[PDB]
Amino acid sequence: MGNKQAKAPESKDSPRASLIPDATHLGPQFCKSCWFENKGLVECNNHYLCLNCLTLLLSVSNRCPICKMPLPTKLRPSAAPTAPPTGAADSIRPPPYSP
Ligand SMILES: [Zn+2]
Ligand SMILES: [Zn+2]
């Protein structure tokens, strides 16, 4: 008869299952908002914007419009150059005798 292995790849160009068939959640390394360039590209969490246009609209002065998500929370500075100990065990209220 002629037994041979056959190949059958699936184009899957337009699938009708899974609403987000895309498996990308980071973004390409090319800024598509202001223009194509790699001089100062910065990768947002789920979005890509370069510093050149990022400064004009700020990274997130109020909200990132491309991420389509609000961020009212803030990130702590994670720094503490000053942190002396305190306790004030000695009670204070009356004036000093001052001999
Ligand atoms: Zn840009
Ligand atoms: Zn963003």
From Swiss-Prot:
Cystine connections: none
GO BP of this protein: viral budding from plasma membrane; viral budding via host ESCRT complex
Domain of life (superkingdom): Viruses
Annotated segments matching region Disordered: 74-99
Keyword Calcium: no
Compositional bias per record (Low complexity), positions renumbered to this chain: 77-89
Location of the motif PPXY motif: 94-97
The entry's keywords: Host cell membrane, Host cytoplasm, Host membrane, Host-virus interaction, Lipoprotein, Membrane, Metal-binding, Myristate, Viral budding, Viral budding via the host ESCRT complexes, Viral release from host cell, Virion, Zinc, Zinc-finger
Motif (PTAP/PSAP motif): 81-84
Subcellular location: Virion; Host cytoplasm, Host perinuclear region; Host cell membrane
Entry function: Plays a crucial role in virion assembly and budding. Expressed late in the virus life cycle, it acts as an inhibitor of viral transcription and RNA synthesis by interacting with the viral polymerase L. Presumably recruits the NP encapsidated genome to cellular membranes at budding sites via direct interaction with NP. Plays critical roles in the final steps of viral release by interacting with host TSG101, a member of the vacuolar protein-sorting pathway and using other cellular host proteins involved in vesicle formation pathway.
Known partners and oligomeric status: Interacts with protein NP; this interaction probably directs the encapsidated genome to budding sites. Interacts (via RING domain) with polymerase L; this interaction inhibits viral transcription and replication, Z partially blocks the product exit tunnel for the releasing nascent RNA product. Interacts with the glycoprotein complex; this interaction plays a role in virion budding. Interacts with host eIF4E; this interaction results in eIF4E reduced affinity for its substrate, the 5'-m7 G cap structure.
Name the record gives this protein: RING finger protein Z
